[PDB]
Nucleic acid binder design. Structure first.
Ligand SMILES: Nc1nc2c(ncn2COCCOP(=O)(O)OP(=O)(O)OP(=O)(O)O)c(=O)[nH]1
Ligand SMILES: [Ca+2]
Ligand SMILES: [Ca+2]
Ligand SMILES: [Ca+2]
Lengths: 267, 1085
DNA sequence: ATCGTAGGGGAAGGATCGTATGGCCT
DNA sequence: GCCATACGATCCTTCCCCTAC
């Protein structure tokens, strides 16, 4: 296998911890792999769900060819990512990814180990999966300057998420503040934060001082998807520099997930 | 003197209805150009030909069409002193009519021919040809229908002895009938006698006394059998007088040569006076049954005439693209083509083209016809449609074609002509056949009534043979259109002309009319070519002669009538009388369990020859030989003298042949001789003729096996389910006995070698595993692994002969039919195999079914040929059987299955390209019932039927196949479906079918997903036996082959690109995409 | 008015069930 | 942990087409 990937228990614990809140969504998703790691792409409610996995997160990750794309499901209703969910198999030992073949005919073979009552061998042989290359594929990934960042904590989601979620008729009016705060007056709730960007629950502990982002969101839906991914909290990254501003909510912790949405391109 | 019988057919006309298009007179300005002329015109009809004007009803001297009629409206158009002698004549049809002495008192008939029909009488008319060529119609008197009644029942219920008193009571009952039509009927019309007869049913029935009643009419017998005391059993009350005349005189036939001979008391047949002629024949005779004899010398057809005809119509009202309607006066028959052949040398004699208006045929068509030696066409021009129709009818009456043919004439041509002649112009066509009047001229259709299953046409002295029906049951094609069959059997690619461009051609000019006439003449020539290639008249005449009925009844009635008529002869000969009585019924044959898979070892096939007839002959199964109760056969030795069987929980006794011979045994013995004779000429000399002898012998086999169907019909005529159930039980027992005998005799190690030393040469490595893997009624498949296929044919024949000798009594014979080399068993009645010679046999699967399109069929055939011919893929398929299918769901496939993926990807590429041929994606569904008789009403072909009816298109009949194509599901299509549902009152239902012509005209895209899914389904269901008969695993494996895994954004790529999103893969095949991944990951991680 | 009975396979419809989570627990 | 539910497959009948006997 020119691109054999081995994931042992030491990193399996981290992968399982990362996937613990991801009990869904990623089951139906695309996986793009290259010389750096694995990126998981999904389109949940028209929202770009991205999960990065760097080479340092695998014990024996390796690649030799160009970028490749694999669809998780094999022969329908059998996801390659079904090993990384809750406690479907309570005896997870090791994960093997076997990429073999030529550049347009690369195939991924997944074999799963098992920590039995008196062993930690392969045992499981009927659960091995095979998936062929996606051939022609185009993937768009959000890239650009993060602009102003911020460290939003877990309790803040009770008011920054459950405020309007009702399209442009009841929008959140994504702003920071005309004086240097992070108070997003949506329509009536008027959540108030103190910003105080370095470099008190009111303070959001922001970074990369911009304090000018005030463009209204394209349409306020959010909610469910962030609720669906069970994200405790994370950093908000802005992409208003591009002609179409975007917002990226990236979780906090090892192998965090990011939800990407498009804002009003009027500016 | 004066014609005794009035001539109903037109002979002198002065007034007629004038209907013709207005674009024919002088091409008037658009104001007075549209529409159709109408009104009443007072002038004699006339016909134009080559600038010559003639009267249609002007028999004598000059003429345009050939004539073969002697009399015309009471005028003898024959040379003086014309008294030809008649000794031998070939009769082809038999008529039947009623005559009275009062009507015939004007003629000079003999006393013996007048006293026999003095109150009323029935005369049998035989129509035929003399060797010279004179049409002859000979009349036979003295035939009266008769039926049997129980003497005890009438004596007990009515209490009337003195059989004359029975006739008096019958006449009194008839006189008091509710209808005022049985007036003047007395006891003299009936003849009651006492006879000793035995009932055919059951073996314990004792001979008794019956009243045999002779009735001297046809409707009187039916009324007596229907209304007169329906509580008394009646025997042979439905047999017509023609059958009585045929069976009373031994050796008489309905189609063959006859000779006139002096009668009993040196009496001779009386030639009839020309003025008293009742038909359109040249010479007529009066005689009785004693004056006719059968001539076994002549065995060739006389110079009969065949008329191949076709008609064309053009809508003359609003929306000219609509199909013509017979009831609409504006719709007209613009042209008729008539080709007259002689049925003795298969040579063209005459060509005629009736056209409404001027018609100049192109010179190219004339040159082409002259190049082949065909006669120059004759074109007759008419001013109105009525003149053309009258001229056609006059030609039919005068020339008198004994045989008439065409294509789709029963459903379209004849009904259209009859409707136009009767409903519009009010013409009596009763006397337009061969009889001068009061004849039969009618067409029956299927319609809503379930009583009939076939459309029929009855014309007296005129055998109509539609070629559509003949083609339908001789070759297997998805579409039975004229162009398709012409390209199939004749291999002649012929041009076609639809009905949507006919009005433009007609309104353009005479040259376009000539082009239309050329196309129509080519159509008629093709129909004649098919008729003379297949020659149905010979086969139908042979069947009619063997059965004992008319050729018309052979063509149109069915299969029960032949068996009943042929059994009536033996019933009368043996002293029996047949009584009159007018969901799954019983259990049939057994199909064994198929061990589905791909077998490389040789497979031999054993089959019984004429299973059911042999069973009936050997076991003596018949109506007369059957007892449902014991103590009625308890005077014969058990087993040796009778056979006891257990059928349906009931014990039945059939006594052996030496005690009481079966009536059906002689029936099958007589019917199998024709098949034996037919099959004896195939291997003698037949390069390509054998394909027709095969169809003939198949038809004879069908009519032979139809005896079992006749005896097994519920609510039929003369039924007895016991015999049919016994035959099925015996067949099942024989099949099981053969299976057990083959398993338990030669299967150990050496018994086959001991029985046949020739097995020493043919011995492949491996042990004997001779076993049966499939069975169907009487066919047994034996997988003889470990033996070479080169020595399994003579050995097979020897084994079959030994089994037949050692297990079954004659005439039951089992023979080794085929010997497969590679077999692929799928399910019951579904398998594809290869014969040892090299031919490939396909049974059951969608390749040999008529409801699949051309693309899927071609792809499946390519896959089957690949699997059965290439060595690598065959070896890989054989190796696939070692592991279960589940292991193949997670293990790479063998390297052999590579060309399969190539075929799959080629098919996918060909199905997903611009400008696809629509004719390769058309499916066909047969309409078998009336649309109102459908419970589901959702079948994807009734939708096409209703769509065609809504737009006033050519509505298909109740027995033809509707073609359709599945269109793509679009917003416009969905809106149209919703509008149609709302007016005529989620994923769309599969009723997306559309007429192919409509899709071609409007350019509608086809649903590629549906066709590709159906292709994959057919491929998996055909080859599911390779993966342990599992559909899901096979489907998943087949879908793994396809590269259709393109994943483009749903039109959201532009918005993301405008937001500063990097591009990965796709056209960017260079290395920067790798950096892009880094460029992405640093943004995320 | 007028041959019979076993079999598979595609299509439209109704009832059944194994899970995916949230509203609610809290 | 919970419990609720709208999705979804998943059979299971019934009717209609052509084929093999
Ligand atoms: N009622 C009826 N039964 C039929 C019909 N067809 C088959 N059978 C039943 O016979 C089973 C053998 O059929 P074949 O085609 O071998 O015929 P065979 O007589 O065994 O002749 P071969 O064995 O020589 O083919 C039929 O059309 N109607
Ligand atoms: Ca026509
Ligand atoms: Ca035609
Ligand atoms: Ca047979």
């Amino acid at each position: 296998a020119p691109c054999q990937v081995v994931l042992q228990g030491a990193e399996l614990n981290g992968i399982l911890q990362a996937f613990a809140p991801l009990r869904t969504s990623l089951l139906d998703s695309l996986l793009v792999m290259g010389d750096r790691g694995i990126l998981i792409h999904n389109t949940i409610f028209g929202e770009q769900v991205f999960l990065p996995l760097e080479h340092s997160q695998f014990s024996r990750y390796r690649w030799r060819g160009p970028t490749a794309a694999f669809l998780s499901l094999v022969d329908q209703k059998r996801s390659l990512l079904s090993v990384f969910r809750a406690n479907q198999y309570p005896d997870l030992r090791r994960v093997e990814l076997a990429i073999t073949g030529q550049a347009p005919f690369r195939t991924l073979v997944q074999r799963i180990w098992t920590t039995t009552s008196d062993g930690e061998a392969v045992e499981l042989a009927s659960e091995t999966l095979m998936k062929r290359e996606l051939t022609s594929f185009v993937v768009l990934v959000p890239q650009g300057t993060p602009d102003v960042q911020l460290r939003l904590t877990r309790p803040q989601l009770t008011k920054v998420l459950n405020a309007t979620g009702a399209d442009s008729a009841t929008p959140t009016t994504f702003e920071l503040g005309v004086n240097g705060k992070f108070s997003v007056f949506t329509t009536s709730t008027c959540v108030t934060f103190a910003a105080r960007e370095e470099g008190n629950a009111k303070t959001v502990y922001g970074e990369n001082t911009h304090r000018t982002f005030s463009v209204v969101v394209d349409d306020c839906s959010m909610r469910a998807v962030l609720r669906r991914l069970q994200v405790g909290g994370g950093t908000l990254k802005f992409f208003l520099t591009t002609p179409v501003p975007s917002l990226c909510v990236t979780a906090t912790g090892p192998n965090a997930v990011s939800a990407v949405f498009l804002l009003k391109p009027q500016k | 003197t004066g014609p005794t019988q009035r001539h109903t057919y037109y002979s002198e006309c002065d007034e007629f209805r004038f209907i013709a298009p207005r674009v024919l007179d002088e091409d008037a300005p658009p104001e007075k150009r549209a529409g159709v002329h109408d009104g009443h015109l007072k002038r004699a009809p006339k016909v134009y030909c080559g600038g010559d004007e003639r009267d249609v009803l002007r028999v004598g001297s000059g003429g345009f069409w050939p004539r073969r009629s002697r009399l015309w409206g009471g005028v003898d158009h024959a040379p003086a002193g014309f008294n030809p002698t008649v000794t031998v004549f070939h009769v082809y049809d038999i008529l039947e009519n009623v005559e009275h002495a009062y009507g015939m008192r004007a003629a000079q008939f003999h006393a013996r021919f007048m006293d026999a029909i003095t109150p009323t009488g029935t005369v049998i008319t035989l129509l035929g040809l003399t060797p010279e060529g004179h049409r002859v119609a000979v009349h036979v008197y003295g035939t009266r229908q008769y039926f049997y009644m129980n003497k005890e029942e009438v004596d007990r219920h009515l209490q009337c002895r003195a059989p004359r008193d029975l006739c008096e009571r019958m006449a009194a009952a008839l006189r008091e009938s509710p209808g005022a039509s049985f007036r003047g009927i007395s006891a003299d019309h009936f003849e009651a006698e006492v006879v000793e007869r035995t009932d055919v049913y059951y073996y314990e029935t004792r001979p008794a006394l019956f009243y045999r009643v002779y009735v001297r009419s046809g409707r009187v017998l039916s009324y007596l059998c229907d209304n007169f005391c329906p509580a008394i059993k009646k025997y042979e009350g439905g047999v017509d007088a023609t059958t009585r005349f045929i069976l009373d005189n031994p050796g008489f036939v309905t189609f063959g040569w006859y000779r006139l001979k002096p009668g009993r008391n040196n009496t001779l047949a009386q030639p009839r006076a020309p003025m008293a002629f009742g038909t359109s024949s040249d010479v007529e005779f009066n005689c009785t049954a004693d004056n006719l004899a059968i001539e076994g010398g002549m065995s060739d057809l006389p110079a009969y005439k065949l008329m191949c005809f076709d008609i064309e119509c053009k809508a003359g009202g609003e929306d000219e693209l609509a199909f013509p309607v017979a009831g609409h006066p504006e719709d007209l028959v613009i042209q008729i083509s008539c080709l007259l052949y002689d049925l003795s040398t298969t040579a063209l004699e005459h060509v005629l083209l009736f056209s409404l208006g001027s018609c100049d045929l192109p010179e190219s068509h004339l040159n082409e016809l002259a190049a082949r030696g065909l006669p120059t066409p004759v074109v007759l021009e008419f001013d109105s449609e009525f003149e053309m129709l009258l001229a056609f009818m006059t030609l039919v009456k005068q020339y008198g074609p004994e045989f008439v043919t065409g294509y789709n004439i029963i459903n379209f041509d004849w009904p259209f002509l009859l409707a136009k002649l009767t409903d519009i112009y009010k013409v009596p066509l009763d006397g337009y056949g061969r009889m001068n009047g009061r004849g039969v001229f009618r067409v029956w259709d299927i319609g809503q009534s379930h009583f009939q299953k076939r459309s029929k046409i009855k014309v007296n002295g005129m055998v109509n043979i539609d070629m559509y029906g003949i083609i339908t049951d001789k070759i297997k094609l998805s579409s039975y259109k004229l162009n398709a069959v012409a390209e199939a059997v004749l291999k002649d690619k012929k041009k076609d002309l639809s009905y949507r461009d006919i009005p433009a051609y007609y309104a353009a000019g005479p040259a376009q009319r000539g082009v239309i006439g050329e196309y129509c003449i080519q159509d008629s020539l093709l129909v004649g070519q098919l008729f003379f290639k297949f020659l149905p008249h010979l086969e139908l005449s042979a069947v009619a002669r063997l059965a004992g009925i008319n050729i018309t009844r052979t063509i149109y009635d069915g299969q029960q009538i032949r068996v009943f008529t042929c059994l009536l002869r033996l019933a009368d000969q043996k002293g029996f009388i047949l009584p009159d009585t007018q969901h799954v019924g019983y259990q049939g044959a057994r199909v064994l369990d198929p061990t589905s898979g791909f077998h490389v070892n040789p497979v031999v096939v054993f089959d019984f020859a004429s299973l059911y007839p042999s069973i009936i002959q050997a076991h003596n199964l018949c109506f007369s030989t059957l007892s449902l109760r014991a103590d009625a056969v308890a005077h014969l030795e058990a087993g040796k003298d009778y056979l006891e069987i257990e059928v349906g929980g009931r014990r039945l006794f059939f006594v052996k042949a030496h005690v009481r011979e079966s009536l059906l045994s002689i029936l099958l013995r007589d019917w199998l001789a024709m098949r034996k004779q037919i099959r004896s000429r195939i291997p003698q000399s037949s390069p390509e003729e054998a394909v027709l002898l095969d169809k003939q012998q198949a038809a004879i086999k069908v009519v032979c096996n139809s005896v079992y169907g006749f005896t097994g019909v519920q609510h039929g005529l003369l039924p007895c389910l016991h015999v049919a159930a016994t035959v099925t039980t015996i067949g099942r027992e024989m099949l099981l006995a053969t299976r057990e005998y083959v398993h338990a005799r030669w299967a150990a190690f050496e018994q086959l070698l001991a029985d046949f030393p020739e097995a020493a040469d043919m011995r492949a490595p491996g042990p004997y595993s001779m076993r049966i893997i499939y069975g169907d009624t009487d066919s047994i498949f034996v997988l003889c692994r470990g033996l070479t296929a080169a020595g399994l044919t003579a050995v097979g024949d020897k084994m079959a002969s030994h089994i037949s000798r050692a297990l079954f009594l004659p005439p039951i014979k089992l023979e080794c039919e085929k010997t497969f080399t590679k077999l692929l068993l799928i399910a019951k009645k579904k398998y594809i195999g290869v014969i040892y010679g090299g031919k490939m046999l396909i049974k059951g699967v969608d390749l040999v079914r008529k409801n699949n399109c051309a693309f899927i069929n071609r792809t499946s055939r390519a896959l089957v040929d690949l699997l059965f011919y290439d060595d690598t893929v065959s070896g890989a398929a054989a190796a696939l059987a070692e592991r279960p299918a589940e292991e193949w769901l997670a293990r790479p496939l063998p390297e052999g299955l590579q060309a399969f993926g190539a075929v799959l990807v080629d098919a996918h590429r060909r199905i997903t390209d611009p400008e696809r041929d629509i004719q390769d994606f058309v499916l066909t569904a047969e309409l078998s019932r009336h649309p109102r008789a459908y419970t589901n009403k959702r079948l994807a072909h009734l939708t096409v039927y209703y769509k065609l009816m809504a737009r006033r298109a050519q509505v298909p009949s109740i027995k033809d196949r509707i073609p359709y194509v599945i269109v793509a599901q679009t917003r416009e299509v969905e809106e149209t479906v919703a509008r149609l549902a709302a007016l005529r009152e989620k994923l769309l239902v599969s009723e997306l079918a559309e007429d192919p012509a409509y899709a071609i005209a409007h350019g509608v895209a086809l649903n590629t997903d549906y066709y590709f899914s159906h292709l994959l389904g057919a491929a998996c269901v055909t080859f599911k036996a390779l993966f342990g008969n599992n559909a899901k695993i096979t489907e998943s494996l087949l879908k793994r082959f396809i590269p259709e895994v393109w994943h483009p954004p749903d039109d959201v790529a532009a918005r993301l690109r405008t937001a500063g999103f990097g591009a990965v893969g796709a056209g960017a095949t260079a290395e920067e995409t790798r950096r892009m991944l880094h460029r992405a990951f640093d943004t995320l991680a």
